[PDB]
Each structure stands twice: as structure tokens, then as C-alpha cells.
Design a protein around this ligand. Structure first.
Ligand code: ADP
Ligand code: ADP
Ligand code: ADP
Ligand code: ADP
Ligand code: ADP
Ligand code: MG
Ligand code: MG
Ligand code: MG
Ligand code: MG
Ligand code: MG
Lengths: 372, 7, 372, 372, 372, 372, 7, 7, 7, 7
């Protein structure tokens, strides 16, 4: 009878809300900011840790830390602060009356899931809890039951194929290349035009530049020749203190790392080759059904050239008699949370919650038996 | 991670 | 007054329908498919066993098992599933109101027939039942009363001679070489050109290739020399995921195992020598009547070169003053069922049904006294 | 329960009073006068040192010495005389019953603060004491919590930026150009019109002329051309002995040294360039908040042309999309004392006094740990 | 009179030497390494391709490619580089004066053998050449004339039965599951403890871990319970850059894929069931002689638990009245080369070399008539 | 045949000479001095700009400007004056007969290199020219082919790892913290003892004090306690006008900013953490070879405590089983020029000069294709 | 292989 | 530099 | 079958 | 001050 909570804890953004809703109620950056100076003015309330948007509004006097990197929680006190700010200050609910659904990347360490279960049952003690895979939730929100999901967020880009409700665990692929690597590469290549960004607040500024101005080129060499020929692709951005910068080919050289990882010195293949290799590792008789149901999800897949480029690259890789379709819904930035809300509201899901007596009898190892 | 990342 | 049911349970295909009809109403592959993975998507109805065409449409996530091998039922729960799907989901009738006619290969174990009688009388309890020999049904569907029937299906190739309505039991021959062995041999010899097929769904793909593209050579050495000389016999096939393969001499090297069993390491003789030896073991005065009435039946005899080759081989074996005729009707893939419908609709057949009180009095051993 | 004392000891003026008040009770010039002649008249009381206004009323027979130069105490006996006159003759209180709050310029020698603590604890022994930064007190009296303070008095012109109650110690700038240098430059350039001032009383007369008649030009070259064209900017001043002098361009050539230090042979930049360089040495995300909160304090910033000139120069230096606001309250001559009275009356300030047992345990080095 | 050369070109290791010797002279990894960066230092000799051990010693700046996968040569220029390094840099001989013996897996494509014949006759032009089956060479090195050989290397695991010098070609089984699949599965399951290996040099590191620390459990469930109970099976390994990792049940979960292929999503049966099915496909009267002569060969069969586990599984599958013996010589990592040296030194083998005039007369198709 | 010129244009020192020599012939400070007063004495030759040592010998009447800040040329007329003084007055050669080799920091703006090429080809027009990376030249002068170079000069501290002649461009780190920041921090903290330095000549005096008297402490807290305990670390320096100053803990608080950048309000990490993070961003198999080949170069690394401190900090950061070696040659102040002389004298370097016809054909953009 | 592997 | 230094 | 097949 | 003022 009690409303469940869905909390997608990504590497760069935390999206929390109630099950049965269409959009997450609280979307805030998952950062913890700490002051690096001394407060000489007394009388007003100055804190030691700023969490979320309050860290972003005061980032000029704070050092910002991400508790999650590549989908792995590195700082657990900061993650506890993130969860406390999500439960009490944003959603404004008591966590002991609502079951909580959490998401996790595939091919992750087991200790991450075990400590997540232990913290959820001992610090914010819930009646029930569950850990789900994000690409399965993206396919849940897509409304279909078959397809291969490429989910790319802030730390993890992973491909998961599912045929008729059955997952293919040997064809699941994970690549540690996402939007934070693109932000770092943009910080590196912005020094060519004479712009220097070194701090964490400057990293947030470069992330805003990448979100506002970058796009995926259909043909990389033709766009590079066009940018070298005329200054028609140049765009201007206004810095917070008043300076105006101009960028040219760096609008499309930054998301080209998704298709050519060797720009940042990585031996792995691109996302199109990863998707093709994940398709070819499945059985033959389902492969055509995976060719026409490519589903995109996550904030990294929101560049305004990526669907046509993915279609062209997969059509080049695949045999010519197959139909290639890329499904890119406009709400794919929040599709993991939408699928979590669909899953937590199902009547058949109420029997696979991990309850408190099961955790009391089994310890923090029941999550390896009742989940993926 | 702990042996080939950092994280 | 009630309409009888005719159910031919072959090794690879199940053909069921009503007596008095011209064609069987339900023809489906006799396979049981089971999922080898875990269903991560909840909400929709996922079963544990897929029977028939539903096993074929979802074979990329299923392991497929044949309950019948070489005309012998090995798995009885799967055979019960096949019979339940044939009665309730395909024919859509109640089995307790209709007598049922079943077929069996000659020289079979007695326990197969006894357990068939026990299952038909105790699980799908019929008013009456009967077991017939498939070659006698092929001669019934041919419309003649004399001749030697070579029936070759998916597990059994058997020769039965009948003269003037009298069978010759000492001249009945059975050879365990049929279409599944040809499919396995094609799967073995397709690796020479660089194509690998190892799974059960790939076995179904190879069976489809064998059904579509194979043919029987009139002269094997001349056709091998022609295939080695020019690429005029090569044909192309499109795989389900889009690849195109090309085959050459394997179009006629695959059904040559029927005439040369030593290709698969078998000491037995070919089907032409088996037919000639079955003719030679009969009485002399009927032998000429068996020379002009060779009747072909079964799906294995549907290669488009087999009648001329069989005629040439038997004419080589027989003395030159005898006339050799091979009867190959175009409907011989279903001729056993047609003869079963002819036999079950006869007015003189109604007194040799095995009724339920006879089964209650004599147990599951009456079928050895009221049948062949 | 006892009322604290706030004593701003500037380089030219001493302002002392009680905490919680709006205006300082005792404002007197910090000079010590000594007679340079022989007293031939006997019977009345002639002293050896005249302190404060009594030094100003009898300055024609006295040599006047400033104990503080450039915010650094040079003569400690004269400074002790100034403090004794402030405590006993002006405020008329016993210093052993009241804690005392003192001010100090940034980037000062440590020995000045240590000897201040030693004298306040051993000669005028207080229950408690504290040393504060004058620009932080100006921001306290402004009522806001963010902004960059330019404090210019008699010896020190310093810029201190503070964002959200946090100081920026690496962006604090100090320039040794203030009103005494302007008085010396006016003393130098008054000889062009035929007026000679060489003594200390004549220096006080020139300081009075500078306070009464000088102003900051909006455009220097246009005002030079206007002064050279017509005698409309000329003003007359009456000397104490009856002579009347007239000055022209020297009304605005004297505070132009604040914007062009090369008039007195200094390599440093102007106050507008120092303010801009202090702004650009901070973080980027706070710079806009420092652009609209420029706070002026001190008696040197009381020229009636300086706010518009600083606004014009900073608007020329800053990018055009930023808003520049100069906050010039009319009570900014005493704003350091007002902020000291605000700080000393706070309930949260009572736990950071430097008490007498702490000085007894730690010696005269505790002030480097309990203060800035 | 000239000494013949024996060159076993496996999927992961190349073993070359002279006929008549006991051990191969040159054993090196069959990899080709290419630099993925730009050489900024000039003067010294940097090459474009590094072959063999030089690829292993400099693998941190190279991308490594295997020219052979699953016993099939995919890259022919890299294979030519491997053969050139084996002939000129390791053996240090001229290939035109020595006949060369090569090995090949059964059930291979014909184009592989034809292109090997063409390359050894046209690029490294030999007086004579021959292609042999590796399991026949393992039985040659075993010293016996009957038995069933299970050869498992880096790409192919194949069973070949031979009775009294006669091979059984219809009972030869090939399974594409070997040590590279075990290395990939170990990479996949090492992410559970928090160790990430994604590059090719990290693949070599994981292969070294698998060679040093893995073993075959006698009972899988009992060993899993023992590993879950106490940390007595945990072992530590030192990485090349100094980190120490610890592994538990992954020591025996990695070679369990040989007996349970469904760990990597493969429908095939284990090696014990493959051996039992290869035995049961032979004639009955020889089957007992195949039960006591199970010969192991290849580097994959060097786990220190595999002989007892194979004995237990085959004894469970076989009837209880038969004797099961597993022959595991200590030199079985090089037994294919030893049998090649035994075969090439025989006086009766000198008449079945494929000479250069026979290749000139018949083209690159003589190898299908003079070999297996 | 013509001798090449090597000119290292650092942020604080210009070192020019001939290729093939051991030491640079002309080492002079890269400053331009201009008079800030009026010359009342006529007859002798007074110039408008003083370049080099003549700027240092007459710095009491000049304002000194550095044309290069943080390895970026800001004033191009002053840089042209520096190059003219280097070519004509110091080296005394015609620049049109000698190719010239120049150095540049990594991660620099492209316009700096382009304008360097344009000025070298159009104002001091050379037959050929080249731009090199300074850390690669330091590794050239070290004589080895592998290692990670930490080069710290007057504006840039950068780490570049090179393995077997191959650079690692994604692991190159640049930090804008060098000796000029240390001079500014010493100027800031010298005000605590009562010494004021504000002008450019006083900045040169403070730089001389820092070069003569500063050292790197092995343990910062123990040395701070030792300096607070007794006056055994105090040292005396004589000013040019006769005053003697004494400094205590400021001898080691000034180069501690290299390890703790937060002393000057910088969010970056120290040089030891930058070196460790540059090592850990490389491949694993080369990391050991980067642990024993740490090469120091530049004048900032000439403090007499820095090698032991860097060894201790890296040994604390690295795993305990690795060997840490810091290579600190005594000639490392000029090692960039020595490596430039080694590189320009190589016979294999003569084919990668940027010639004048290539500049005429391609414009000032060829330097991005023929260099780093 | 070429149709059902890779290789 | 030009946007985040000075230089 | 059960003695020389399988089946 | 004591070394570059006076004061
Ligand atoms: N419009 C956009 N264009 C390109 N990238 C974007 C856009 N919006 C967000 N991103 C990137 O997507 C990431 C956030 O996506 P999301 O999947 O919500 O992250 P998380 O991993 O926290 O769930 C951010 O790192 C951001 O850089
Ligand atoms: N057109 C065809 N050409 C060659 N073989 C065929 C053809 N049609 C069916 N077959 C083979 O015949 C077998 C089915 O024949 P059928 O006698 O119906 O089987 P069952 O033994 O199940 O009765 C299948 O194994 C199939 O491979
Ligand atoms: N109206 C005025 N116009 C210009 N300058 C003034 C004015 N009033 C005071 N001053 C100058 O300001 C200085 C005193 O300012 P204040 O900050 O109170 O001094 P202190 O440094 O002692 O605190 C004096 O040197 C005086 O010359
Ligand atoms: N001691 C060992 N334990 C387990 N596996 C091993 C051992 N030694 C080698 N291997 C594996 O055996 C393979 C090499 O065996 P080998 O038969 O020589 O390969 P090839 O197929 O090249 O002939 C390698 O993939 C290696 O992983
Ligand atoms: N003995 C020394 N001890 C400490 N620092 C020094 C010493 N000698 C020179 N330096 C510093 O090193 C810098 C010059 O180093 P160098 O690498 O030659 O500069 P550039 O960047 O011009 O090449 C100067 O800023 C100087 O402060
Ligand atoms: Mg996400
Ligand atoms: Mg049949
Ligand atoms: Mg003041
Ligand atoms: Mg091998
Ligand atoms: Mg340098």
C-alpha cells in the first residue's frame, strides 16, 4: 500500500522520486563541496559540506568531489550524504516507510552492491529494497520486450541485449568511456585556442559548454575540412565573469572519442563496434530482431548527431539486407528512472523485494541471490 | 576499481 | 458415428487430423524447446516448455529436443506434451469422444507400442485405439493391393512387400538411415567451405538448406567431375541474420549417403540394394509383380533426382527382361496419413478396434494380439 | 556583562569608544607634540608631551610626531601615551574591567601585533583582547556578507575580497599610498604658485587645505585643459595668520596620485588597477559578485569625485556585460569602528577573545593562532 | 639426407625445430605487435611490427594480434611474419634446403590447408611439405598404436579415436572451447572482486594468472562450499607494477567451463561427455580398448586436477565393468611436436612427402589427395 | 654543412648557442627594461630599451618586463628584441645562414608556435627551423631512451613520460607553478619579519635571495618545530645598499609550495602527486620502468633537498615492492639546451627540418604537421 | 570461420 | 593565457 | 534402442 | 618598516 521510491544514483546526476510517476521529482548533481578557506565573518551559518545544487551555486569557494566514478562508489560517507540529502531534503519523506529501488551498472564489483544493501538496511533502514540493471529499466521504459540497449551516462557505457524477456549475459559489454571523459578531453583540447581550465568549477563550466555546444559529425573528415576551410561552424560562449570564447572544430572533436577512443589513448573500439560485437555474440536467429530495435538511453546519447551516425556505422558493419533502426526517444535522459517506476508499480514485482527478515537471516549477501 | 582504473 | 482421429507421429513431424479427410489438418515439428537462460523481464507470460511451431519461432533462446529418435520414443513426458498439443491446441477436440489411429515403424521394440497403448488409454483415455504399419498405410493410399513400399522419413527407412493383400514378414527390411542423418552429414561437410553450424537452431537451418537446395545425382562421378570443372551447380542461400553462403558439390554429396552409407561409416548397403534384397527374399512367382510396383513414400524421398536414380539402380540389379516402375506420387509426403484416413473410414475396420473393456481385461498386452 | 571597548588606531586618527554604539565617542589626531623652546615663564603648568587636540591647539611652539606610519607603529612610548590619553582622558574608564578590540592592516609585520598584545596585557592589562582586519570590519558595517573592500586611510590602501563570509587571502593587496603621501605631494606642488610649507604645523595646514578644497577629476586631461583655459576652478583659502592663497589645478592634481602613483615616483599601479587585479586573482564564478559590491571605506575615499571615477575606470577595465557598482556610504570615515562595534557585541564572538590565562600560558604568540 | 623441419603452429604458441630431436628448439608466442603511438625520439631503430617474445617484452606500447584463432589462420601477412621469424631468426636456417612438416586441426576449412601449401611452396619454397593431424601425432609420441586422443590447446579441443593404426573419421569430434575462452572468462569473472583487465597486455597478464594459479576441482559444489566457508583456497598474485591481488573460487571456476560450457553461454556438452560420445560412436568390439587408452595432450590439459576429474566423470558415464585409464604424460605440452619428429624421421614416411614437381603439376589441390 | 643554432627561450632565462657544443654560449635574463624618468644629462648615448644583463646592471632606473609568462609569449615586440639581442649581440652571427632549433612547453596555444614560425621565417629569415618539446630534450641529454621527465623552470612545471622512444601524449601533465610563483610567495611572506619588496628590481633581489638561501625540507612539520625551537636555521643576506636581513623558516616555507600548492591558493596537487598520477595514467607493464627513471631538469629542481623529498613522497605513494630512483644530474639547469644540441647534430634529424619552400607553400601552419 | 564463429 | 590565467 | 544405437 | 620604506 505504501508508495515505493525509485532512486537512480548515476555517476554525475542523482534522480529520485516516487513509483508510478512520469518524471523524477528530484534531479540534482551528485557532488559534495567542501570549503578550502577560512571563514572570517561570524554570525551566519556556514556548514562543512555542501551537497547538490548548493554545491553548484557556491562552487567558487568549494572543492567538489564526486562520490561515484565509473559507476563505482569510492567515498561512502559522501554517498551517505547524497542519500540523506535525497531522502530528507529533496523528497522530504521518512525512508523507513517506503521500499527503495536502486540501479547499478553491469559487470560491477560485488562489494558495491553489498555495501549498498548494508547501508540501505542499517542506516536508512527500509522495509524492502532491490537492485536493478539500468539497461533492463531502459527497455522497460521503451515499452517493448526485445532489443539491445546502449546506455551511456557519466561513467559507464554498456550494451545489454534482451530477446523476448530473456537477457543474454555473455553478450553484455561494458566500456568505461562516458561524459566525464569527454569533459576531460574538452578541457585538454580547449588549451589549443588559448583557454585554460584546471579547477573543478572550471570542469563544471566546460561540462556546461559541452552540453550546450557540442554535436556529433556525420562524416569526421569532411567536417574537419569544412571547419578548416571557413569559420561557419564557430560558436561563441559567455563565461560567468564576462569573457566570450569561440570554438570551432572542438564542437565535434569532443564526442568523436565515443567512436574513436584512441583520441584519449584507449585500446578499445567505438560504441558502434561494441554494439555490433554485442549483436554478433548472440544467437543467429535473434540477430535480425536486434538490428531493428537499437535503443538509446542516458544523457551522453543526447548529442544532436548521434542517431544518424550510429545508424550509418551499424549499416556499414551489418549485411546490406538487414534493416537498422535506432530508437531515440526524447525522454531518454530519464528513461532508467521511468523504467524503474514501471517496474516498482507492477503487481508481479511485489514478491521479489528483499525484505528486512531476509537480510537479518542472510546478512548482506542475499542481494546476489535475489537480484542479477 | 582497485587494480587497473582508478575507482 | 463419432469421427476417428488419425495421428502419424513421425520422428521429425507430427501430422494429425480427422478420418475421411484428404489432407492432415495439423502438421507441426515434433520438438520441445526449453529456455537455457533467465528471464529478467517480469509481467508477461513466459512458459517452461515450448511445443511445435512456437519452439521454431523462438529457437534462438531455446534448446530443442526431439522426443522420437529412429522411430523410438525416448522421452515420454515430451511425447505426452506433443500429444497434448496435438489434441487440445491444434485439433481442438476432446480425446475421450474419438477413437485414435496411430502409426509405428516395423521391427520396433514392443515396449514402445505397449507404452503408447497405456498412455492412450490412461492419460488421454479413448473409446478405442489401434496401431498400424506405415508402409501398409502407404499402400492403402496408393490405391493398389500389391507392391513393395520404401518408406523413408526422419528416422527409419523401411521396405515392406505386400502381394494381393498378404504381407511378407520375413522380407521386411529396416535401415536406420534417414533425413536426420543426412542433416548431420551436411552439417559435417559444410565445414569444408568455412561454415560452422553446431547448435540445434543451426541444425534446423541446415535442415532447411537440405530441403531447399539438395538433389540426387543420376551419375555421381560425372556430377562430381562437372562440379570440379565449372561453377554451374553452385547455389546461394541467405542466412536468417543476413549472410549469404554458397554450396557446390554438397547439393548432391548429401543424399548420396542413401545410396552409399559408408560416407557416414555404416556397413549397410544402399536403399536400392535393400529394395533388391527385399524383392529377392520373396517367392519367385510374385517377384515380377513387385518389380513394376515400387512405391515411394515419406519426406526423404522428395529429392528431385531420386526416382530416376532408383529406377536406374534397380534396372542394373534386376534381369533385363523385367519391367521396373517407380511410383512417386506428388502427395507422398503425407501418404501415410492419407492411408490412415482410408483405413479408419472403412466399414470392415470397425470390428478390429482395441476397445477400453478389452484393455481393462487384458492389460497393455492386447496390442500384440489385435495388431501387427 | 562588561561593555567592550573598540579602538581603531589609524595612522592619522584614533577613534575609540564603546561596543554597541553607533558613533565613536573619542576621535582625536594621533600625534605627540614636544616643545622646541625654553619656558621662561614660571608658575603655570607646562608639560613635556602634548597628546591629541592639545597638540593641535598649541602646534606653533611644538614639534609634532606621528607614532604610526604606514600602519606600522614606530615609536612605542608615544603609542603608549596615545593609548593612555584614549583610555583615561577621553573615554575616562579603567582598562582592566573592559575587553578591548583593536584593528590592524593586512600584510603587516608580526612584531607589531605581538608588541600590541604585550602592551595591552602588561601595561593596560585587560581581561581579554582581539586584533581584527579593518576591511573585514568595513564589510561588517556594510551589512552584507560578500564584496571587495578598498580601505584607504592615512598610511595604507588595501583591497580585501570576501565571498559568502570566506576571505581570499591570496588576493589581498596592500599599497603604501594614502592621504599623508597626498599631503606631501600637495606640499611639494604648492611651491609652484609661491607658497612654502616646511614645518609640521604647516603640514597640518596643508592637510586641512587638502580636506577642504581637493576633489577627484572625472577626466584628467579635460580638467587640465579647462584649468589652463579659464580661472573657473580656482579657489581661495585663508591662512591662520590672515593671508589668502588661491589654488587652481592643484585641487585635482593631488588625488590623481591615487590613480597615477608615478607622480610621486612609484612603480605601482593605481587603485582601480589594484582593485581589478584583486578581482581577477579570485575564482571566476565569484567575480561577478565582486563586480557589483565594491565597498569604499576610510577618509581618503571621501573626495567628492572618486566614486564616479572608480566606476568609470573599473567599467573600462572589466568586460562590458558585467554590472559595476560602487558602494559609498556617507558614514564610511568611521565604518571600521562601526564594524568593530558590530563584531564585539555579537553573541558568537565571546568565545574567540584572547583571555589573560591564554596569554600567560602561551606568551605573546597566541595572537598568531587566535586571529588572522 | 637433409634434416626435416617440424613446425607446430598452434593458436597461441609456435613450436619449431628439427626432426629427430626430443624437444622443440624454438617455442615462442604467435603474436604480432604494432605500435599505437608516435615515436618522438630519433636515432635508434624502431620497427613497425614486433614478432614473438619481442612483442611480449614491449607489450605496454603495442597492440597485439593473434594471426590464428580457433585453429584457423585469419591474417595471412601476420602468419607469413610468424613463419619468417620462425625460420630465419629462431631456427636460423634456409627453408629451401629442408622439407617442412606442419600440423592442422581436424574438421578445418580446406582453404586454410590450400593457402598453407601455396605459401610454403611459393614464398618459403621447400623441396617437400606435408600437413598432419595433431592428435595422430600425439598418439605417435605416446608410443602406442591404439587409443582416443583428446587434444586441447589455445583454440581447438578435439577428440580423435584410432584403433590398431586405423582412424575412425566419423567419430572425430571438434569443440571450439580452449584456453583463450578460459582467459576471457577469467577476465569476465575477475571484475567481481574489483580487478579490471581490458587491454591485450592485460589479457596476457590474465593468461599468466590462469597458468600459475588455476586448478580443476574434483567436486565443484563441495569446493564452492569450502571456498564460501573459509579463506583457505585464496591465493595472492603480484602484478607487474607492484599491486597484489587475491583470488578465491575463481581458481576453479575458470577451468570448470571445460566441463560446463554453459558458463560462457554455449550449448555444447563438456569434454568428458564429448569423449564418451566419441567412444560410443565407434564399433562396440573396440570400445573397451578405447576405455583404457585415453591420452591427454596440449597445454590446456595441464591443470593439476584434470586427470582425476576426467577419470571420475568417464567412470560415472561408462558401465562399471570397464577399466578407465587416463594417460597424462608430463611432456604432453609438446607431444604434438614430438610425434611430428617421430613421424618425419621414419624411413617409411619419405615416400609420402608432397614434392615440388607434384605441386607444379597439380597446383595447390594435391594436399587434399596426399594427406588427411 | 652550416652549424645549427639552439635557442632555449625560457620564461626567465634565454640560453642560446651552437649545435654540437657542451654548454650554451649565451645565457642571459630575458627581460626588457625601459626608463621611467627623464634624462637631464645630454651628450652620452641613452637608449629607450635595455635588453638582458644591461637591464640587470641598470635596474634601479628601469621598469623591467618579462616577455614570456608561463611559457606563453605575451609581448611580441619585446620577444623580437630578445631574439635580436640573442642573435646579433651575443652569438654575433647572421641568422640567415644557420637553421635554428627552438623549444616549447607542452599543452601550449597553437598561435604561440605559429607566430614563432612566422617571426623566424619573416624577420630573422632562416633556411630551416624546428620546434621541440623540452622534456624530450631533457631525456635526450640524459642519454637514456625511457623514463618520465619532470621539467620545472620559471613558468611551467610539466611531466612527460616516454617509453622506448615512444611518447605517451595522454599522460602528459602541465602545472602552472614554477620559480616566479615561488619568488612572489617569498615576496609575500618576507613582510612578516619586516622587509618590504614591491618593485621589479626588488623582485630580482628576492629571486637572488631565493636562489642563494632556500632549500627543501625533508619533513615540513619537524623542520617548522626546529625553526620555532632554536635559531639554528637562520641565515643572513646583505642587501645591495648595505642592509643585512635575516630569515628563518622562510628558507623552507618557500619551496614547500611545490608540494603544497594551497599555500598560494591553488587547487592542484603537488609535483610528487602529479608525477605519480602521470605514471599511473600510463600502461601497467611500463610503470616499473617509469619508477626507476625519474629525471629532473630545470632550475627550479636545483634546491638542495628536492631529490630526497621526491624520493620519499613517491616511495610513500608507490607500492612497497618497487624501486624508486630520482636522476638529478648536476648540469640539469642547462639539460634542455644540451639535448637540443644532441638532437640538432644527429644525421637522422636533417630530413625533418621545416624548410623555407615548405613554409612558402603551406604558410605558418606547417609546424603543426612537422612537429609535436 | 566466415559464417557462425568469428574466425 | 586569455580566459582562466592571466597570460 | 538400449544395446547398439543410441535410442 | 626596516628594509625598503622608512617605518
Ligand atoms: N544535451 C546534452 N548533450 C550532451 N551531453 C549531455 C547533455 N545533457 C547531459 N549530458 C551529459 O550526460 C551526463 C549525464 O547523463 P545521465 O545519464 O543523467 O548521468 P548519470 O550517469 O548520472 O545518470 C553528463 O555527464 C552530461 O555531461
Ligand atoms: N522437399 C524435401 N527435400 C528433401 N528432404 C525433405 C523435403 N521435405 C522434407 N524432407 C525431409 O523429410 C523429413 C520429414 O519427412 P516425414 O516423413 O514427414 O518425417 P516423419 O518421419 O516425421 O514422418 C525431414 O527430416 C526433412 O528433412
Ligand atoms: N573630506 C575629506 N576629503 C579628503 N580627504 C580626507 C577628508 N577627511 C579626511 N581625509 C583624509 O583621510 C585621512 C583620515 O582617514 P582615516 O581613515 O580616518 O584615518 P586613519 O588612517 O587614522 O583611520 C586623513 O589623512 C585625511 O587627510
Ligand atoms: N600450466 C598450465 N596450466 C593451465 N593452462 C596452461 C598451462 N600452460 C599453458 N596453458 C594454456 O595452454 C595454451 C597453450 O597450449 P598449447 O597446446 O601449446 O597451445 P597451441 O594451441 O598454441 O599449441 C595457452 O593458451 C595457455 O593458456
Ligand atoms: N640554485 C638555485 N636554487 C633554486 N632555484 C633556482 C636556482 N637557480 C635558478 N633557480 C630558479 O630557476 C629558474 C630558472 O630556471 P630555468 O629552467 O633556466 O628557467 P627557464 O624557464 O628560463 O628555462 C629561475 O626562476 C630561478 O628562480
Ligand atoms: Mg545512468
Ligand atoms: Mg513418417
Ligand atoms: Mg584607518
Ligand atoms: Mg596445439
Ligand atoms: Mg626551461
Amino acid at each position: 500500500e505504501t508508495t515505493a521510491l525509485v532512486c537512480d544514483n548515476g555517476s554525475g546526476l542523482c534522480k529520485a522520486g516516487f513509483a508510478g510517476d512520469d518524471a523524477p521529482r528530484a534531479v540534482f548533481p551528485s557532488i559534495v563541496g567542501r570549503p578550502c578557506h577560512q571563514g572570517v565573518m561570524v554570525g551566519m551559518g556556514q556548514k562543512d559540506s555542501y551537497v547538490g545544487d548548493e554545491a553548484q551555486s557556491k562552487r567558487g569557494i568549494l572543492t567538489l568531489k564526486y562520490p561515484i566514478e565509473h559507476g563505482i562508489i569510492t567515498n561512502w560517507d559522501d554517498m551517505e550524504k547524497i542519500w540523506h540529502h535525497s531522502f530528507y531534503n529533496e523528497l522530504r519523506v521518512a525512508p523507513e516507510e517506503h521500499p527503495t529501488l536502486l540501479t547499478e551498472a553491469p559487470l560491477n564489483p560485488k562489494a558495491n552492491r553489498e555495501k549498498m544493501t548494508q547501508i540501505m538496511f542499517e542506516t536508512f533502514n527500509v522495509p524492502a529494497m532491490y537492485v536493478a540493471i539500468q539497461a533492463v529499466l531502459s527497455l522497460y521504459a521503451s515499452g517493448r520486450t526485445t532489443g539491445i540497449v546502449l546506455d551511456s551516462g557519466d561513467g559507464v557505457t554498456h550494451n545489454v541485449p534482451i530477446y523476448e524477456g530473456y537477457a543474454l549475459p555473455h553478450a553484455i559489454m561494458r566500456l568505461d568511456l562516458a561524459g566525464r571523459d569527454l569533459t576531460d578531453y574538452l578541457m585538454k583540447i580547449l588549451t589549443e585556442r588559448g583557454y585554460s581550465f584546471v579547477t573543478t568549477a572550471e570542469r563544471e563550466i566546460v561540462r556546461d559548454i559541452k552540453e550546450k555546444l557540442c554535436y556529433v559529425a556525420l562524416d569526421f573528415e569532411n567536417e574537419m575540412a569544412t571547419a578548416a576551410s571557413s569559420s561557419s561552424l564557430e560558436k561563441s560562449y559567455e563565461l560567468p565573469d564576462g569573457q566570450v570564447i569561440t570554438i570551432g572544430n572542438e564542437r565535434f572533436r569532443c564526442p568523436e572519442t565515443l567512436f574513436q577512443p584512441s583520441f584519449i589513448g584507449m585500446e578499445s573500439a567505438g560504441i558502434h563496434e561494441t554494439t555490433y560485437n554485442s549483436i554478433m555474440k548472440c544467437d543467429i536467429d535473434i540477430r535480425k530482431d536486434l538490428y531493428a530495435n537499437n535503443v538509446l538511453s542516458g544523457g551522453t546519447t543526447m548529442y544532436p548527431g548521434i542517431a544518424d551516425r550510429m545508424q550509418k556505422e551499424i549499416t556499414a558493419l551489418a549485411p546490406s539486407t538487414m534493416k537498422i533502426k535506432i530508437i531515440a526517444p526524447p525522454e531518454r535522459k530519464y528513461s532508467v528512472w521511468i523504467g524503474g517506476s514501471i517496474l516498482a508499480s507492477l503487481s508481479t514485482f511485489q514478491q521479489m523485494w528483499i525484505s528486512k527478515p531476509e537480510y537479518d537471516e542472510a546478512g548482506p549477501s542475499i542481494v546476489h541471490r535475489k537480484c542479477f | 576499481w582497485x587494480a587497473x582504473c582508478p575507482a
